[PDB]
Design a protein around this nucleic acid. Structure first.
Ligand SMILES: [Mg+2]
Ligand SMILES: [Mg+2]
Ligand SMILES: [Mg+2]
Ligand SMILES: [Mg+2]
Ligand SMILES: [Mg+2]
Ligand SMILES: [Mg+2]
Ligand SMILES: [Mg+2]
Ligand SMILES: [Mg+2]
Ligand SMILES: [Mg+2]
Ligand SMILES: [Mg+2]
Ligand SMILES: [Mg+2]
Ligand SMILES: [Mg+2]
Ligand SMILES: [Mg+2]
Ligand SMILES: [Mg+2]
Ligand SMILES: [Mg+2]
Ligand SMILES: [Mg+2]
Ligand SMILES: [Mg+2]
Ligand SMILES: [Mg+2]
Ligand SMILES: [Mg+2]
Ligand SMILES: [Mg+2]
Ligand SMILES: [Mg+2]
Ligand SMILES: [Mg+2]
Lengths: 113, 138, 181, 39, 261
RNA sequence: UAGGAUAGGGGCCUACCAUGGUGGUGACGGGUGACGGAGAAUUAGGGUUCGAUUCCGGAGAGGGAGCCUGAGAAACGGCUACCACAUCCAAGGAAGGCAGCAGGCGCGCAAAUUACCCAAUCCUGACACGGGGAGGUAGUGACAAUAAAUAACAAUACCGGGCGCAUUAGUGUCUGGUAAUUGGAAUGAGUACAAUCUAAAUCCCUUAACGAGGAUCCAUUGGAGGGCAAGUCUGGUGCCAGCAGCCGCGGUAAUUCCAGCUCCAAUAGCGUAUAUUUAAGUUGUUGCAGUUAAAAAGCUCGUAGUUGGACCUUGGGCCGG
């Protein structure tokens, strides 16, 4: 029995997204997963694609029952691909990650040719 | 009495400057000899014990205050250093590494002890209080 | 290294003469009546009160019609009337000197709880504040020195989650019931 | 030096009880209050 | 040092950039441009901090190299461009114009305009004097230069520059009795009509100004910027018509704001 | 003055001429455990001390000196030479510079990680795109600062003061304490599904089932002659050991030592040590003192310094609130 409201909401067709600060109120509930918020935001904005949502920076205020955070609704998944930082895509699983070992990442390799 | 002229600011600043020297504490701090003293402007000073000696006590009292001659490893001075408490001297031993703290009274000898300004607070890197109160033995 | 630049200071100063029967008894009076955790708690109040009183004194040194005086006096009396520390018609900037640590200990949420009831004791009040039991508007305040304002006094009350008036019982209740049934 | 530790060794050894904790923090000041000037 | 300093740490960034203390070590460091880098506002501070069209450094980079942003009528890919006073920013994707104006507190505002009151900009002249082959030209404080200037235009005057013919359309002769909008010092922001101008041999010539509602101040010739001839300015002034009001009145206005709400 | 050199003024240098410049208003020299400043501590006012340090300016790369490339370097995460130091050597030669991050030796009273990341702030490149030990995050962290647990409420009880009468009672009201008393309540310290956080993990903030009987989920640091709040308690010691910042305790009835019980002070802090500010009107400009306590030159002349007698119309007014 949880609620869902937004504020500080602005649409910029520069980066082709609608960006908001959501103010979720979940009395009794421990907290709400970002995935669990995805379907509610998607069905209240009928975004036609529940993958165009990227929501983050959740807090769960002192005392519990109310959490804040940012949200990003894109209007073409193409623009979601291009105007996004690399890690929210990985969080939603839209791309995968690799690891580094930087001995002669460049140093020894700057010697031979 | 005072020069209260309006244009005598030079005279009064120079007077206070010359007369600030007849104050003992100022002369002691701004003459530099703390840097010829054994700590040479130090809080504590670590050293090595040469022998536990024992020195008499001033006339109103009567005792053998158990002091240790130590040598300072930072500058080579040798000094005396009280070992404060009942029986606690025995934990000290010759050529053990001891931290010489101030004994109090800000660089001037304290109590009935003649010519001692320094106290031992650590030996072999273990708290001398800890050995007195059997908290942590060396 | 930024995060270096974040200021921070102190909240009190220890008294000059450590050992006097008169000051020591006065401090024990205040700590006993307002149920404090130690006399650091008392000692903060005098620091804050000294700061505000000195602010008032510097103003009263100057003259009326001075824009600084009017502005800061208006602000100061607004601050005090918001915490219910000066009364009606007593917006004068001379009754802000007459305030004393009685008045600041009068506003701590321990005192407000005990005077609103709901506590049965002031030392009961402090703990009841600390076991996440009382909100103010809708947020639980677990600070015994919350300094409740007058437009917040009317609606201090129990939780929506605490055993006394909110929802589920405590763990000892649920243990007793589970071994009773 | 032969007399170092003299009285420290002379004194007999005596051991404590298990005095019940006197409550710390707030309750300690409660007891000081209602022991000094409510009693 | 041995060369140009290219980092600007956050606490050295001028007071009127309003940027917070603990958000990081550095500040955008405006590039050497058309405005004096002490009296400027970079495009990142325009997009990110004020308009919130982005939320990071890279997001403003995305905004700018989409080619969306326009300065003085021509697209700009720079991200520490030192915009200044009466630079116009258009965003044709949003069909939306800003003209970058002070307020009375000394900070920049983005005062909106329509297109007819955006086709031109407005700036003063640093100096008018000769060049190659004896052709006169003038140099503004905007960096801009104009060749064959109208032989009446003198130094300290102000001109309007259309963004298509790219030359004068009119000029206001810096004189007593026309309104200014001071752009430096403590009085910056406050509009008002000159009542006097006193000159001293060998140093700065000061201007005495009055806020149209009575208050009177003075400032040296550097920071005055005549807007319009007479009392009527030729630019749409910000929300508060260039009147700096005492802090007491800023209290009364907020009391009056809350007491009707 | 004439010129050279420089990006340019200039004794920056040369030739010639002149003999000047500074100095009791402290030059020059000497000391500095002296980079300068914004500022830090203390502050009734005046002041006193400090300022390596993250912001700005300067300087320096082991000590000096000289240079190329370049708009910018007398650059050292560039070179050339010398001095100090040291490395590899197949014995010919060659390569060096952590006052960058991390780390090791040493010095010392005295100072953490040989971790992760470019996600944030900004810079940099031919550049949306790479790089960034700048920077940020996690680890040690009682440098300092903040909030803040270690119990609360009840009736029984030997009690203990009014108040129901006060007499003569008795018990009775705020519950004061010794109650491992008796009892059901509450909770987080900790543990833990998760979720959230995060560039990825983690701390936190939220929260499922755990998680309290006072021995435990146990609070200490310094004292109890005065200054200074709190023992004319009990045993030992016998001017010994020892305490004691000062005064003093200790030589057989020790409130001071050493210990047990009790109490006090602060209490997650508290003592010791040195430097320093207040106290200190004992540095006195505000604000000291010089008959006798420390202190008027033996006396006069005296140049600079300091200080300087009275006098010169805004004298009576209209005016508008
Ligand atoms: Mg004596
Ligand atoms: Mg540098
Ligand atoms: Mg730039
Ligand atoms: Mg010449
Ligand atoms: Mg030096
Ligand atoms: Mg620097
Ligand atoms: Mg070195
Ligand atoms: Mg250099
Ligand atoms: Mg060099
Ligand atoms: Mg190096
Ligand atoms: Mg290092
Ligand atoms: Mg003792
Ligand atoms: Mg004792
Ligand atoms: Mg005493
Ligand atoms: Mg006493
Ligand atoms: Mg002591
Ligand atoms: Mg004593
Ligand atoms: Mg003296
Ligand atoms: Mg003195
Ligand atoms: Mg005197
Ligand atoms: Mg005499
Ligand atoms: Mg004379």
């Amino acid at each position: 029995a949880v609620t869902l409201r937004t504020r500080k909401f602005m649409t910029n067709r520069l980066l082709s997204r609608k960006q908001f600060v959501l103010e979720v109120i979940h009395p009794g509930r421990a907290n709400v997963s970002k995935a669990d918020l995805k379907e509610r935001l998607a069905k209240i904005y009928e975004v036609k694609d529940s993958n165009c949502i990227f929501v983050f920076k959740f807090r769960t205020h002192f005392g519990g029952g109310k959490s804040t955070g940012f949200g990003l609704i894109y209007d073409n998944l193409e623009a979601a691909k291009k105007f996004e930082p690399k890690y929210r895509l990985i969080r939603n699983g839209l791309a995968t990650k690799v690891e580094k070992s930087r001995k002669q990442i460049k140093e020894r390799k700057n010697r031979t040719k | 009495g005072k020069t209260r002229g309006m244009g005598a600011g030079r005279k009064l600043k120079t007077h206070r400057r010359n007369q600030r020297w007849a104050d003992k504490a100022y002369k002691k701090s701004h003459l530099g000899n703390e840097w010829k003293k054994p700590f040479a402007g130090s809080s504590h000073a670590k050293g090595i014990v040469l022998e536990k000696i024992g020195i008499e006590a001033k006339q109103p009292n009567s005792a053998i205050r158990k002091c240790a001659r130590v040598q300072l490893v930072k500058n080579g001075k040798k000094i005396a250093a009280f070992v404060p408490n009942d029986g606690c001297l025995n934990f000290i031993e010759e050529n053990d590494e001891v931290l010489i703290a101030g004994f109090g009274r800000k660089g001037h000898a304290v109590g009935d002890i003649p010519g001692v300004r320094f106290k031992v607070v650590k030996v072999s890197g273990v708290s001398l209080l800890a050995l007195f109160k059997e908290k942590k033995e060396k | 290294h930024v995060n270096f630049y974040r200021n921070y200071g102190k909240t009190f100063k220890k008294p000059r003469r450590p050992y006097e029967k008169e000051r020591l008894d006065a401090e024990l009076k205040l700590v006993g009546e307002y149920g404090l955790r130690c006399k650091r708690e008392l000692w903060r109040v005098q620091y804050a009160l000294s700061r505000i009183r000195n602010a008032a004194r510097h103003l009263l040194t100057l003259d009326e019609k001075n824009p600084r005086r009017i502005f800061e006096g208006a602000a100061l009396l607004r601050r005090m009337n918001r915490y219910g520390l000066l009364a009606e018609g007593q917006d004068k900037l001379d009754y802000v000197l007459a305030l004393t640590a009685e008045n600041f200990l009068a506003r701590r949420l321990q005192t407000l709880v005990f005077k609103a009831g709901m506590a049965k004791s002031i030392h009961h009040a402090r703990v009841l504040i600390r076991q996440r039991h009382i909100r103010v508007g809708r947020q639980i305040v677990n600070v015994p020195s919350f300094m409740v304002r007058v437009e917040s006094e009317k609606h201090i009350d129990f939780s929506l989650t605490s055993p006394f008036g909110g929802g589920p019982a405590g763990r000892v209740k649920r243990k007793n019931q589970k071994k009773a049934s | 030096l032969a007399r170092a530790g003299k009285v420290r060794g002379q004194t007999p050894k005596v051991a404590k009880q298990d005095k019940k904790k006197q409550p710390r923090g707030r309750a300690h000041k409660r007891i000081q209050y209602n022991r000094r000037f409510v009693t | 040092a041995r060369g140009l300093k290219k980092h600007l740490k956050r606490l050295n960034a001028p007071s009127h950039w309003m940027l917070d203390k603990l958000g990081g070590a550095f500040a955008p460091k405006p590039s050497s441009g058309p405005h004096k880098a002490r009296e400027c506002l970079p495009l990142i501070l325009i997009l990110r901090n004020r308009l919130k069209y982005a939320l990071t450094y890279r997001e403003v980079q995305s905004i700018l190299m989409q080619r969306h942003i326009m300065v003085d009528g021509k697209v700009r890919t720079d991200k520490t461009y030192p915009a200044g006073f009466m630079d116009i920013i258009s965003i044709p994707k949003t069909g939306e114009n800003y003209r970058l104006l002070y307020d009375t507190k000394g900070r920049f505002r983005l005062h909106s305009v329509r297109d007819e009151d955006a086709k031109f900009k407005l700036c003063k002249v640093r100096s008018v004097q000769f060049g190659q082959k004896g052709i006169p030209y003038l140099n503004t404080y905007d960096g801009r230069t104009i060749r064959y200037p109208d032989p009446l235009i003198k130094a300290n005057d102000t001109i309007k520059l259309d963004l298509e013919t790219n030359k004068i359309v009119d000029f206001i002769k810096f004189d007593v009795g026309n309104v200014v909008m001071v752009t430096g010092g403590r009085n910056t922001g406050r509009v008002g009509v000159i009542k006097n101008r006193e000159k001293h041999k060998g140093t700065f010539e000061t201007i005495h100004v009055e806020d149209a509602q009575g208050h009177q101040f003075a400032t040296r010739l550097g920071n005055v910027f005549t807007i319009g001839k007479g009392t009527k300015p030729w630019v749409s002034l910000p929300k508060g018509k260039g009147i700096k009001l005492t802090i007491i009145e800023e209290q009364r206005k907020r009391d009056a704001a809350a007491q009707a709400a």
